[PDB]
Design a protein. Sequence first.
Length: 380
Amino acid sequence: GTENLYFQSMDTTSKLALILADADLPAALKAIALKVQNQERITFDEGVYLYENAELGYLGVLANYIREQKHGDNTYFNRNFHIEPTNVCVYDCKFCSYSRLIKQKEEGWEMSVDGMMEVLKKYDHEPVTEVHITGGVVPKQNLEFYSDFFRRAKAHRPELHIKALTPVEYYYIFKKAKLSHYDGMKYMQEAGLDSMPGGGAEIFHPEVREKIAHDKCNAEQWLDIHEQAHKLGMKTNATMLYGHIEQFWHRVDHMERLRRQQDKTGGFQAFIPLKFRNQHNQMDHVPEVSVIEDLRNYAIARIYMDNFDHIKAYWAMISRQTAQLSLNFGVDDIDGTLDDTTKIYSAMSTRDLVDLIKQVKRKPIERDTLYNVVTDYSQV
Ligand SMILES: Nc1ncnc2c1ncn2[C@@H]1O[C@H](CCC(=O)c2cccc(C(=O)O)c2)[C@@H](O)[C@H]1O
Ligand code: MET
Ligand code: SF4
Ligand SMILES: [Cl-]
C-alpha cells in the first residue's frame, strides 16, 4: 500500500518514465507521454483525447515535465497597476457585467485623458514596470483619446511599459479611424503602445462565440491584430475563457488557432486560461467547472501550447489553493495586483505571494518586461 506514495515521491523525469512503463495505461495515453519525452507536438485529436480521457495525475506528470524542462522552479510575477478607462461598454458579452444589456451608461463612468494621467501619477514613487489598460469600449474613447494618453504617459514616465487594449478595442477604433490593422498598430506603437494584454479572445469558434460574444471582433480580426503587433516587434499575451458552455474541442480549436499564429509570427509570451465565473452576468445559470477541471485545463494548455514560453494563472479569479496547485500542473507565471503600501491614517502583498510560491517548493522571481529577474526571493 505504498505504490501511490512511491509514484508521488518520484522526480519529474522518473514520473514520466514510470508512466511509459505502465502496462495497464491505454496505448493512446502512452503515445502522447512518449511525444512529450521526445519534445514532439501534440495534434488536435490528441488534445481532444487528453480533455476527454486523461486523469489529473497523468496530466500533472506531462505538464510538470514540460514546465520544469523550460523554467525549472522559476515562478514569475511582475510589479504593475491597472487603469480602467470606463466600466460601461457598447458590446454584449453574455459572461461580462459591463454588457450594454445589463448595465446602462448612467450606472458607469468614463475617464478623460487628464483622469488617466492623474491615476498614472499616483504610482510615480512605486517601482512598477508596467501599466495594464483595459475596460469597456465606448465611442468617446477613440484613436485620438488613446494616442493622446500614450504620448502623455511616455513623456511623463518613459520607462513605464504600456500593456494597453485588446483587438476588441483596436478593431473598433481602427474601423472608425479608417486605419488598416497594420497602420493602426504602427500608429499606436509610435504614440507609445508597448504590448497588448490577452483579453477579448473568449472562445474563437463561431458556434460558441455567436452565443457568448456576438457583436465584438471575431477570431479572424483578433488574430490579425496580434499578427500586425508581432510584425511590428510587439510581444502580446493570449487568453481563453473556458468552463462555460463550450465543448473540449472548442478549447482545442482555440489553442490550435493560437499555436498556428505563434508558428507564423512568434510574438506571444504567455497563454492565460480564464475560468468562467457565473456571478453578475447573463450566464448566471451556467455552472462553473471543478478545481480538478481547472488543473486538467492548465495541464493540457502546457502540453498543447509547445511554442508559448509561459502558462500564466490570474490569481484574482481562483482560490489560493488552485493558484498554488496550478504551479504543479504547467503554470510558471502569475498575474496579480501586488499591493505593498502601508495604510498611513487607517490585497496580495509581495510577502504573501512569495510565501504562497515557496509553500509549493517553487522559486519566486519578481520579473521585468524581458522576464529577467528584478528580485529572486529564493535568495532572500
Ligand atoms: N465572468 C467572467 N469570468 C471569467 N473571465 C471573465 C469574466 N468576465 C470577463 N472575463 C475575462 O476578462 C478578460 C479581460 C482580462 C484579461 O484578459 C487579462 C487579465 C489579466 C492579465 C492579462 C494579460 O494579458 O497579462 C489579461 C475578458 O476578455 C474576459 O475573457
Ligand atoms: C474588460 S473586457 C477586456 C477588454 C475588451 N473590452 C475585450 O473584451 O477584449
Ligand atoms: S467587450 Fe470586453 S468589456 Fe465590453 S462587454 Fe464584452 S467583455 Fe465586457
Ligand atoms: Cl485585457
